Design a protein around this ligand. Structure first.
Ligand SMILES: [Mg+2]
Ligand SMILES: [Mg+2]
Ligand SMILES: [Mg+2]
Length: 533
DNA sequence: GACCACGGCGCC
DNA sequence: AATGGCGCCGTGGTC
């Protein structure tokens, strides 16, 4: 429909582009086009044409920006219809879906993608007419965040490859020791990576008791939860659990990651997906750097591989109990607020009449369990305690936090009536199953509905913090590298590391004052692990 | 080679 | 913390 016109397009044009593969740091830019004023302009030479653009404006704008940055061009992402649609309804996660829903078709041609971006923007922008709070999120959070994310993705993080290569060889030997032992105990070799073959050995051959079933197909489960309950029923179980941890870590982190170092940067580059979750959280992929191990000994060895550039240091910042602090704000519960106001540690309170680092991490679990409606039975089982004691603290927990219960009840009722729930800033998630006539389904929905305002507000705060923090770091010559939901990892020159850490901490803590203070813990170090002071 | 569903599990 | 939110592994299957 659009009149074909020579490259370049006029300022403000919407861009379309085709990548050889989804990851922009690795993609070949196959085609580039732009649409505006009833015309479409197709670039004869996509790479060179990139220099003609003032900004990347259109579907998946950030992806193009990342590729431009990769090529040394400071091309910032602007409007992206995906972000508008994601704010309207976070189930809007793909261009295929968004195009279908809001006025077009996602094809494989740059020109059509440019045209599509233009008309989708017009339509979506119109749908936002009147949605003042979603507009504010778009302008103050999502749109500027996309530029920040573009820089993070293009910067990447340094990884000690030789170290991981050496580690792989060690872990391989330990795994061989484990599988050889398991096979002896089974009385025959099988594929130990097959949970189906494992199922038969444990429950049919060795005749161990099958405890639970798998969700979709009803097989006898061999999950860690089950194996843990059998650890003293046969010596093969512990060996299997150790085999699981080692192969999990080797196959997911140790072996793959070193092979993903980019030839130009010498660094590892993730993608931070901005329209991928139902709550407003970011996600990370290709590879996921938001689930790097940290809990077990080997897991910590893996995390140590993430290092600062020579002459620089990593600065790691974490919000402390951001979700509970958020819950205190949203519910307005006086006591829970008094808890954070008076700089006390809540999990401690409960831990005493329940200081050990285990008698606390057990008090945290319970606190969150009752929070999510865990009954006196369902919780007394999961945790080594009688049903009585379960129902016991359940009643008091809410006796002392009455407004938390009332907030949950109010949130669900409104969710049922409106069809959606919302964060502090008005980000929405639609949850229709709050009215289902099947209890298990309805109650699953209720746990999602109630979680979203809390997890989503925490996400809103972190995103806003990232938006505020980025320009300050640029001025100081520091970089933002990673976000892990309630954590940030920065890279700073050694001489400036301490100042950067102080500043970033203050920016994060004061991003948007609540009824309770936000607290941030900060560490500095040569690697991701050591940086967690 | 690709895709899928699944069970399973890494992080927040 | 993992109840909630994700992404990736190998297996088993298909195309
Ligand atoms: Mg933490
Ligand atoms: Mg799954
Ligand atoms: Mg296969």
């Amino acid at each position: 429909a659009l009149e074909e016109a020579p490259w370049p397009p006029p300022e403000g044009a919407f861009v379309g582009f085709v990548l050889s593969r989804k990851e922009p740091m690795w993609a070949d830019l196959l085609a580039l086009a732009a649409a505006r004023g009833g015309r479409v302009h197709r670039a004869p030479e996509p790479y060179k044409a990139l220099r003609d653009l003032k900004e990347a404006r259109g579907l998946l704008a950030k992806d193009l920006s990342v590729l431009a940055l990769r090529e040394g061009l400071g091309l910032p992402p602007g409007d992206d219809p995906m972000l508008l649609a994601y704010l309207l309804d976070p189930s809007n996660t793909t261009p295929e879906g968004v195009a279908r829903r809001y006025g077009g078709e996602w094809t494989e041609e740059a020109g059509e993608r440019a045209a599509l971006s233009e008309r989708l923007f017009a339509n979506l922008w119109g749908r936002l007419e009147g949605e003042e709070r979603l507009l504010w999120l778009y302008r103050e959070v999502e749109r500027p965040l996309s530029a920040v994310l573009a820089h993070m993705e293009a910067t990447g993080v340094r990884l000690d490859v030789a170290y991981l290569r050496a580690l792989s060889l060690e872990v391989a030997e330990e795994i061989a020791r484990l599988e050889a032992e398991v096979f002896r105990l089974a009385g025959h070799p099988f594929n130990l990576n097959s949970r189906d073959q494992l199922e038969r050995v444990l429950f049919d051959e060795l005749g161990l008791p099958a405890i639970g079933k798998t969700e979709k197909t009803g097989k006898r489960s061999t999950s860690a939860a089950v194996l843990e309950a059998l650890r003293e029923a046969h010596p093969i179980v512990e060996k299997i659990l150790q085999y699981r941890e080692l192969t999990k870590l080797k196959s997911t982190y140790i072996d793959p990651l070193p092979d993903l170092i980019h030839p130009r940067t010498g660094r590892l580059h993730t993608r931070f997906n901005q329209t991928a979750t139902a709550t407003g959280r970011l996600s990370s992929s290709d590879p996921n750097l938001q689930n790097i191990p940290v809990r077990t000994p080997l897991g910590q060895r893996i995390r140590r591989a993430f290092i600062a550039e020579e002459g620089w240091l990593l600065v790691a910042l974490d919000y402390s109990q951001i979700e509970l602090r958020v819950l205190a704000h949203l519910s307005g519960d006086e006591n829970l607020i008094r808890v954070f106001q008076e700089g006390r540690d809540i999990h401690t309170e409960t831990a005493s009449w329940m200081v050990d680092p285990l008698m606390r991490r057990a008090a945290k679990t319970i606190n969150f369990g009752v929070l999510y409606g865990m009954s006196a039975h369902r919780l007394s089982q999961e945790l080594a305690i009688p049903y009585e004691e379960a129902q016991a603290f359940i009643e008091r927990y809410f006796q002392s936090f009455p407004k938390v219960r009332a907030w949950i009840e109010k949130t669900l009722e409104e969710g049922r009536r409106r069809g959606y729930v919302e964060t502090l800033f008005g980000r929405r998630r639609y949850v229709p199953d709050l009215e289902a006539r099947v209890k298990s389904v309805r109650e699953a929905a209720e746990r999602m509905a109630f979680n979203m305002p809390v997890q989503g507000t925490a996400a809103d705060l972190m995103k806003l913090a990232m938006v505020k923090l980025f320009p300050r770091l640029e001025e100081m010559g520091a970089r933002m590298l990673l976000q892990v939901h309630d954590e940030l990892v920065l890279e700073a020159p050694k001489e400036r590391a301490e100042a950067v850490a102080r500043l970033a901490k203050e920016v994060m803590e004061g991003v948007y004052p609540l009824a309770v203070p936000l607290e941030v813990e900060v560490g500095i170090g040569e690697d991701w692990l050591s940086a967690k002071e």
